[PDB]
Design a protein around this ligand. Structure first.
Ligand SMILES: [Mg+2]
Ligand SMILES: [Mg+2]
Ligand SMILES: [Mg+2]
Ligand SMILES: [Mg+2]
Ligand SMILES: [Mg+2]
Ligand SMILES: [Mg+2]
Lengths: 79, 132, 195, 101, 315, 517, 88, 49, 171
RNA sequence: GGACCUGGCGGUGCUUCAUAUCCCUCUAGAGGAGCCUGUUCUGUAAUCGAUAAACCCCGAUCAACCUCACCACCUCUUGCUCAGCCUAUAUACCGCCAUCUUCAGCAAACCCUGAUGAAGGCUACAAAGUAAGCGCAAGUACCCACGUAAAGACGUUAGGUCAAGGUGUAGCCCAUGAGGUGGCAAGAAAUGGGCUACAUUUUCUACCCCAGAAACGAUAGCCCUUAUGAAACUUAAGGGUCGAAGGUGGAUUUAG
DNA sequence: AAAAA
């Protein structure tokens, strides 16, 4: 079951450990809780790969940057 | 009356064969199965695609041979080696039979991603069993 | 048009090899095999269906290509590829003390051109935690960190690893998990006084 | 060449739901939460309501692939309960035999 | 007709030669049983009917016994009683009537000078290529009975025994369980039992008190109802042996009554080791050494409980 | 490669050829109908992707380009269209995948296209010279090719071996009465190429040897020297040069075996091992060896061919249909002339059923040798093969089979002989008659059947063709043996009324049969 | 070959499902259908990687057209590189 | 995807490969209905004209 | 959707309906019915409305020791083969409309006076060539049974005769 | 007008049985009551069919906004894969089935008797019957040979369905066709089926009966909350005061 | 309600 199914040769440190995708996010508050939740969700998803997780993180970052006033008025400072 | 696929008993003039002559409840007793694949067991899936491929192959074999066949066709899905083993009548030239066999094999191998080899049987006509 | 040619009935002598006739999985062609096989549903005054046009014989997966002499020749021809099993691994005790790590494989079969299977990407790491440096505090900490996945009777660890669509990556992830587990024996924190 | 419009509409709804699905999944994930600021839920509801229909998975109806029957379809083979029974009685698919007990 | 038979015979023998050559044995020692085994190994027919099996025997079994020709080129039949439909049956009737009158004459002369079973209509019509009815068969059986009741001797005795058969076994007695000794195990014996989906393995001893152990613990904690206690006491009560036999059974599967009956059957079948055969026969004729195949009936798709229908009214 | 049922079993050779051609035509029409509609082969289901699922396209994907579009239309109404497009869109002509293709495919038009591509811009000189040589070799021209090769060699470059091979071919094969001059020119060209530092391949030497052997017939020393030079270059040489040398040596040496031995030694030294691949038709040498062994009754050449065409690989054994038939006929003749009876029959059963059938003369010789040694068992198959091969050879085969059974009567154990005679008579009667009818009548009279003999006599007496004197004498004896000269009188009357030579003798025989019986 | 394997007969399973015999008002008649299948596992012992691969190849070269096959081979290994004194 | 299958069937019918008797019977019935007096309605015949 | 193509014989049976209840009970007329014309006869393997010559399905394969090419017919040949098919179907319709000359006997629709011909020969080897059969009376007999309703029975009186005094009759 | 043959029927006579059938008879249910789901009626613009023993948790093993065949409003006259109907006939079919069917009779080839009329052909101490084939018996599987399941012809009901799926005949595509938004399961009233209980046989607590206690349970409706669903006007579930006839059914019936 | 050199 490995012929034509190498998943772009990506290792397990990029599939499981998603610590390298937490830069423009705070450490306390509901934003960090949501980030931990989505990290736990993506880390236990054997149907997706690293590219899908990167695309999801990029879409979340774009959604957060598009609605900046909402994040400012949500009783938290988006760092 | 549960009129099924069995042959009706009326007047002695229908040259019925041996396949569909039996009752539909004698399949696992006095008959068999035309198709055979792993999709019919517990724990396996993708049976809809197999049934669609089987019915499409049956329609294609019936359309490409308007009367050249006798009864039906036995399917053997050996993972990735399909075999349409059937019979052939003694009415046309062997050149046409070879041409049709080669064309069908090439079409199968270039469409369904599976090589097919035939095993023709020399019979005079339909394998008749009863003149009822 | 029409012709008449003698089949293999008049060609087979008395000492003809069977695998030399049908070396591949043949579906048994009655037009060439002169074996008078008969089966079906007979009647009161008559005979059952013979071999000509017998679809039931074609449905039955015949094993004529599995000739005993052919099996013998194939077994004698594949002796070069076979390695050698050492006598030290015959007993289960030495085989388990010298190789306690077990990695189960998953290789299924399909009926179509595709061989993909999301269920064939899981490994079962069954390592008997009894041939390592398991003391007292380390063993207690490992048991309290595992919970119920580690059996206390047979001492066999069972961890279902299937978080990536590869087997070697699953093995590497299991090795990394075991590494992090064993790191707790040499790297403590500060919550052991309130045990 | 097609003969029925119901199966065509069903397969078109299936295709449009397959194409437009990640956005709906993200909106549904952003909806169901414990705390979370209400403005995010409000804008998610607005975004999921501004999109038209013919894409919701609820609008998908499981029917046969040859007869397009909405009721009495086994998910194993995905077809009506008549053609499958007839093909099984004809003696084609293995295993599917009449229950003799 | 004979040409097709010879063709079938030659095809059969060349097929036997080819099979003996491909198997690797001598064709003379290649018996019909080996032929059937090779055909079953090479042609695995997975069906339920015993007639749809690939066979390759002599054409005498495939083709039925064809009726021979009784007339020649001149036109005169070879048999005397041929212009009457049935020939062999009437010839046998004439022969048995002649034997009857011979026996009557012999009995008159003697007075003046002072395991097996009969044949079957099916077997008779299969042995002799001739069809008959039932009244004539009953008359022939009555004539044979009159022949047997008369004073027979040797010739008529063997003549009436040639039309006889042999019944099978009639003693349905079970096998007596021997005494087994497993590591200092005196009076040790085991048994099984299967009824109402319940499997029990009783271990009857002849050296303890009067208690029953079920899966280690006693039967009081496992059988709180007196019904199971009476069902298990019945076998020990039928033999007048209570406080001198101890058992330790390990039953599994089924409810309380099913497991109780399974243990009862196991004890009944295991007690056939330290007692005579008359006692086990008395136990069998009373209801102990017998199976109880009372299994739950298969529910039908249209009935309430395998018997009662649904709600069928009249209007 | 065919089937297994009797209705499609490859019996003779024409049936196998027809089946193979029908299979090839079916594959071609399948590829055509698949590549005709590219919109039906664009959905890939298998994840590993079988490489046999990508259809080929003949239309360009980028029409805005010029040289790339021309190259895609030509290689990856073709060459001319590409040249017109390049001239219209102002595209430069390259030296690779252009001039060579125009010189090979498109010999005046190809040569003109090559000259135009060479004179269009200042490209490579060696490639232009090779293209000119290839265009001139197919148009009976060698001076221009030699001049181009000399220019490419003197222009501070290394000329390819293809141009030299084409020049040698056009100078030797495309000439008349030349053997020493071609060899001297080839030697001078080789010396010039060695002095100008140029690597020479064995293909050019093989082509030169083939062109030298295809001209003269007494060219043995030069062919041997060319074969030695081609073999002393690297691996095994081509088989075309060896086949040409064998054909040139066997054409002159028909009385002595020295020429045949020299040809066999040259063929073994050039390519005498496994299936060597460096020529365009490796089966030509095997076919020539089989023909030589069948025409000269050689016992060593056939054995060497069977050992070098079957032990190593089954590639250099039979390439064409006629070559396969000739090889089978030669093998049958060798088995009939060397082996006894059982070994010859086993070889014929293992060779004819595995490959194709025989030829004609060798097959007839083998049949005559088998019939002369008392072996009449496969008469029906031989008659069927003779009838399927032609409408005239069947009658000759029937006559040859009946000539050995008409003069022989029925003895104590003559059942097989009588059956063979009856089969031959039936094959001779079912051919569409004089000699064949007389032979059939003699066979029917010598068999023993009275009704068959009477029918044969009635068919021969009504076919406007009387028989020989032996058949008439046998008929008279058979009529007199039953004390009835009516048949003899009728035969004499039919012979005298049909204007035949049996007049006075037939009358005397009838009178003797009537007097004695 | 000299492998000496064992084989037993695990219990079988039968998948059953009830379908309607007609399509209209005929609830009193139902034609049920079963799915009979068997299981026969092979207990192999003492086989290296090359021997197991050759055996799997020889089995797949003679595979029927209506059976399944799942391979669960456990490999032997002492200890990996980083397990005694690793870093992070 | 029944579209590609229908297109392939129509292509084989136009070329004369997949001899489908159903389409032949349909064409026969259409020709009979046209020669009887009930042809296929065209643009400009019915309600307006 | 498009996979609803069944078998041709079933389609013809559904379009004709030979086992109709209106013909076995005398409730309907025999004139009101639908005729059948077969289509699987004059259609060679590999024949369409475009034209593609096959080297094995029509023209001989081995043509002077060479293989023939696979080209496509133009328009004039297509019009010619269409006209040929039109003429063929017209000839078929003409042959299916011509009725044979029924030799009348005593009157119009009456079997009395119609010569059937020589009788059937005996199984022993006796053939009656001098005798000739003649139909005298024909009548349909009905009888109310239990299940078939009005069971129709045909009773014909046929006489035999040769012309030499020896003759007879039978019902 | 008279006479003869067959079928159906006789509240027509005699004879052998009713192994769950009729009572004397044993048990459990349908109109005592409530909830849910259907037939039908009413209002509205809001599918239809079966609607008599053989139809009523039936087509449907899924109807909250496609599924939806109905209606109101807006478009398209290739009208979407150059092709159909979302309209009428199952008194044009193929195909899938029903009480009879809780048994055994019917169709090819001959002969005889009814003066060769429609018809019949049974007498084993035997006066003209032989019968290919069909369905059971014979046969397959499960707990064997018991029992159960699967099967059980030629037909009455122009039986149910062009509404698994496709085909004949009518009318149309400048629609009786197709796409978009919403509504349609609301109540004067009759009727069938499933579940619930109508107290010391019941209810609860841990061990499913060596126990104790309170002289009983499922449903309107209401509030909060939860799995999916873009938004519960209902069929899902959990929590909470109230919690509706209930106190063992008489005109007729069914199975074991 | 008769039979594609
Ligand atoms: Mg039924
Ligand atoms: Mg519509
Ligand atoms: Mg109707
Ligand atoms: Mg039966
Ligand atoms: Mg049944
Ligand atoms: Mg109706």
């Amino acid at each position: 079951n490995e012929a034509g199914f190498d998943d772009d040769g990506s290792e397990f440190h990029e599939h499981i450990f998603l610590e390298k995708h937490l830069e423009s996010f705070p450490k306390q508050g509901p934003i960090r809780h949501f980030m931990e939740l989505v990290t736990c969700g993506l880390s236990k998803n054997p149907y997706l790969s690293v590219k899908q997780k990167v695309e999801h993180i990029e879409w979340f970052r774009n959604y957060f940057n598009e609605k900046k006033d909402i994040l400012k008025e949500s009783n938290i400072q988006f760092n | 009356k549960n009129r099924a696929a069995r042959v009706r008993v009326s007047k002695g003039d229908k040259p019925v064969t041996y396949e569909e002559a039996h009752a539909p409840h004698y399949i696992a007793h006095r008959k068999g199965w035309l198709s055979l694949h792993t999709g019919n067991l517990d724990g396996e899936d993708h049976a809809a695609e197999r049934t669609v491929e089987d019915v499409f192959l049956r329609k294609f074999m019936w359309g490409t041979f308007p009367g050249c066949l006798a009864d039906q066709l036995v399917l053997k899905r050996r993972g990735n080696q399909l075999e349409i083993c059937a019979v052939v009548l003694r009415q046309l030239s062997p050149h046409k039979y070879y041409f049709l066999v080669g064309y069908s094999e090439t079409l199968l191998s270039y469409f369904y991603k599976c090589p097919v080899r035939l095993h023709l049987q020399t019979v005079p006509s339909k394998v008749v069993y009863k003149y009822l | 048009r029409r012709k008449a040619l003698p089949p293999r009935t008049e060609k087979m002598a008395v000492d003809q090899d069977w695998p030399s006739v049908y070396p591949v999985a043949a579906p048994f062609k009655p037009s060439a095999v002169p074996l008078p096989v008969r089966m079906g549903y007979p009647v009161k005054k008559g005979v059952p269906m013979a071999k000509e046009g017998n679809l039931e014989l074609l449905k039955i997966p015949n094993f004529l290509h599995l000739t005993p002499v052919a099996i013998k020749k194939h077994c004698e021809a594949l002796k070069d590829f076979c390695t050698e099993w050492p006598a030290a691994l015959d007993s289960d005790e030495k085989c388990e003390k010298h190789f306690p790590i077990e990695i189960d494989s998953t290789d299924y079969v399909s009926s179509g051109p595709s061989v993909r299977n999301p269920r064939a990407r899981v490994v079962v790491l069954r390592v008997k935690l009894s041939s390592l440096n398991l003391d007292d505090h380390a063993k207690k900490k490992l048991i309290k960190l595992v919970g119920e996945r580690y059996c206390k009777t047979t001492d066999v660890l069972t961890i279902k690893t299937d978080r990536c669509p590869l087997r070697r990556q699953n093995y590497d992830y299991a090795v990394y998990l075991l590494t992090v587990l064993y790191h707790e024996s040499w790297n403590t924190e500060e919550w052991e006084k309130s045990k | 060449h097609y003969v029925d419009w119901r199966m065509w509409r069903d397969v078109k709804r299936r295709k449009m739901a397959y194409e437009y699905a990640d956005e709906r999944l993200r909106i549904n994930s952003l909806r169901k939460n414990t705390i979370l600021p209400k403005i995010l839920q409000d804008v998610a509801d607005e975004e999921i309501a501004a999109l038209p229909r013919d894409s919701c998975p609820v609008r998908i109806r499981n029917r046969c692939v040859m007869t397009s029957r909405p009721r009495g379809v086994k998910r194993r083979w995905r077809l009506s309960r008549i053609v499958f029974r007839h093909l099984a009685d004809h003696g084609q698919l293995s295993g599917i035999q009449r229950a003799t007990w | 007709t004979e040409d097709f038979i010879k063709k079938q015979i030659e095809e059969f023998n060349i097929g036997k030669r080819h099979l003996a050559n491909m198997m690797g044995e001598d064709p003379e020692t290649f018996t019909q049983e080996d032929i059937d085994r090779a055909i079953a190994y090479l042609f695995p027919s997975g069906l339920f009917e015993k007639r749809a099996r690939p066979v390759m025997k002599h054409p005498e079994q495939i083709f039925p016994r064809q009726r021979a020709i009784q007339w020649g080129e001149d036109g005169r039949p070879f048999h005397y009683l041929f212009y009457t439909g049935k020939q062999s049956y009437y010839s046998l009737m004439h022969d048995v009537y002649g034997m009857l009158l011979n026996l009557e004459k012999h009995q008159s002369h003697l007075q003046a000078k002072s395991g097996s079973r009969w044949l079957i209509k099916e077997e008779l019509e299969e042995m002799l290529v001739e069809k008959l009815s039932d009244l004539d068969y009953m008359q022939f059986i009555r004539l044979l009975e009159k022949l047997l009741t008369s004073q027979c001797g040797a010739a008529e005795e063997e003549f009436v025994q040639r039309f006889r058969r042999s019944v099978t076994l009639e003693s349905k007695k079970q096998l007596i369980e021997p005494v087994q000794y497993d590591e200092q195990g005196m009076a040790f014996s085991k048994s099984e039992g299967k009824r109402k989906t319940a499997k029990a393995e009783a271990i009857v001893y002849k050296h303890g008190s009067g208690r029953i152990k079920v899966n280690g613990i006693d039967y009081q904690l496992y059988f709180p109802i007196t019904q199971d206690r009476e069902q298990l006491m019945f076998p020990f009560h039928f033999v007048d042996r209570l406080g001198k036999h101890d058992v330790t059974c390990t039953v599994s599967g089924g409810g309380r009554s099913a497991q109780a009956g399974a243990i009862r059957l196991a004890m009944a079948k295991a007690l056939c080791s330290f007692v005579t055969e008359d006692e086990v026969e008395w136990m069998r004729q009373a209801g102990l050494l017998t199976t109880d195949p009372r299994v739950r009936e298969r529910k039908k798709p249209g009935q309430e409980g395998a018997r009662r229908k649904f709600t069928w009214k009249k209007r | 490669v065919f089937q297994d049922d009797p209705y499609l079993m490859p019996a003779s050779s024409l049936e196998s050829r027809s089946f193979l051609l029908a299979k090839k035509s079916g594959e071609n029409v399948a590829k055509f109908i698949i590549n005709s509609y590219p919109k039906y082969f664009q959905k890939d289901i298998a994840e590993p992707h079988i490489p046999c699922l990508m259809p080929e396209y003949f239309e360009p994907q980028i029409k805005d380009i010029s040289e790339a579009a021309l190259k895609e239309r030509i290689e990856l109404e073709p060459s001319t269209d590409y040249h017109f497009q390049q001239t219209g869109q102002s595209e430069a002509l390259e030296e690779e995948n252009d001039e060579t293709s125009r010189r090979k495919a498109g010999t005046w038009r190809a040569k003109n296209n090559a000259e135009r591509i060479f004179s269009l811009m200042p490209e490579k000189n060696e490639h232009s010279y090779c293209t000119m040589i290839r265009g001139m070799v197919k148009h009976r021209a060698y001076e221009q090719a030699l001049n181009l090769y000399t220019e490419l060699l003197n222009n501070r470059l290394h000329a390819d071996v293809y141009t030299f091979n084409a020049l040698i071919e056009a100078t030797v094969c495309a000439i008349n009465e030349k053997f020493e001059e071609k060899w001297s020119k080839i030697l001078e060209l080789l010396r010039h190429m060695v002095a100008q530092k140029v690597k020479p391949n064995l293909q050019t030497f093989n082509t030169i040897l083939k062109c030298l052997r295809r001209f003269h017939v007494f060219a043995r020393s030069p062919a041997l020297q060319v074969l030695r030079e081609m073999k002393a270059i690297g691996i095994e040489p081509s088989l075309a040069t060896y086949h040409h040398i064998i054909r040139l040596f066997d054409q002159p040496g028909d009385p002595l075996k020295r020429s045949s031995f020299i040809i066999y030694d040259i063929m073994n030294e050039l390519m005498g091992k496994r299936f060597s691949p460096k020529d365009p038709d490796d089966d030509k040498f095997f076919q020539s060896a089989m023909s030589i062994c069948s025409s000269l009754r050689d016992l060593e050449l056939a054995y060497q061919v069977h050992g070098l065409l079957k032990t190593g690989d089954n590639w250099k054994f039979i390439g064409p249909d006629q070559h396969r038939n000739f090889y089978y006929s030669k093998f049958f003749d060798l088995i009939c002339l060397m082996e006894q009876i059982d070994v010859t029959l086993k070889w014929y059963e293992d060779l004819i059923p595995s490959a194709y059938f025989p030829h004609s003369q060798t097959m007839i010789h083998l049949l005559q040798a088998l019939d002369v040694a008392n072996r009449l068992e496969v008469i029906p198959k031989i008659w069927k093969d003779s009838k399927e091969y032609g409408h005239t050879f069947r009658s000759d085969l029937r006559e040859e089979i009946l000539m050995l059974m008409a003069r022989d009567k029925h003895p104590p154990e003559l059942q097989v002989a009588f059956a063979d005679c009856a089969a031959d008579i039936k094959s001779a009667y079912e051919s569409q008659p004089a000699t064949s009818l007389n032979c059939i009548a003699i066979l029917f009279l010598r068999a023993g059947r009275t009704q068959e003999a009477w029918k044969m006599l009635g068919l021969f007496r009504k076919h406007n063709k009387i028989p020989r004197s032996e058949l008439l004498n046998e008929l008279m004896d058979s009529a007199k043996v039953s004390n009835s000269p009516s048949q003899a009188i009728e035969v004499v009357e039919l012979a005298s009324a049909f204007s035949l030579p049996i007049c006075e003798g037939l009358t005397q025989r009838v009178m003797s049969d009537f007097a004695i019986n | 070959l000299g492998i000496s394997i064992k084989v037993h007969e695990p219990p079988r399973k039968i998948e059953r499902f009830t379908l309607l015999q007609s399509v209209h008002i005929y609830k009193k008649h139902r034609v049920q259908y079963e799915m009979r299948t068997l299981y026969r596992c092979l207990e192999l012992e003492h086989l290296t990687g090359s021997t197991a691969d050759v055996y799997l190849e020889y089995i797949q070269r003679n595979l029927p057209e209506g059976v399944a096959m799942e391979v669960t081979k456990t490999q032997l290994e002492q200890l990996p590189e980083h397990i005694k004194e690793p870093i992070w | 995807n029944h579209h590609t299958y229908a297109e392939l069937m129509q292509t084989l019918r136009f070329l004369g490969l997949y001899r489908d008797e159903h389409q032949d019977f349909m064409d026969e019935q259409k020709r009979l209905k046209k020669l009887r007096g009930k042809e296929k309605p065209k643009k400009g015949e019915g309600k307006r004209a | 959707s498009f996979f609803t193509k069944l078998t041709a014989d079933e389609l013809w049976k559904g379009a004709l309906a030979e086992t109709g209840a209106g013909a076995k009970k005398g409730r309907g007329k025999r004139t009101k019915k639908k005729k059948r014309k077969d289509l699987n006869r004059g259609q060679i393997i590999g024949e369409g409305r475009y034209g593609f010559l096959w080297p094995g399905l029509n023209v001989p394969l081995m043509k002077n020791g060479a293989v023939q090419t696979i080209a496509q017919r133009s328009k004039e040949e297509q019009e010619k083969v269409e006209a040929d098919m039109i003429q063929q179907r017209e000839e078929w319709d003409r042959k299916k409309k011509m009725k044979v000359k029924r030799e009348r006997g005593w009157s119009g629709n009456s079997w009395g006076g119609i010569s059937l011909g020589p009788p059937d020969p005996g199984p022993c080897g006796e053939t009656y060539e001098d005798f000739d059969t003649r139909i005298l009376e024909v009548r349909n007999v009905f009888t109310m049974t239990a299940k078939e309703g009005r069971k129709k029975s045909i009773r014909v009186l046929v006489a035999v005769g040769n012309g030499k005094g020896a003759a007879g009759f039978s019902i």
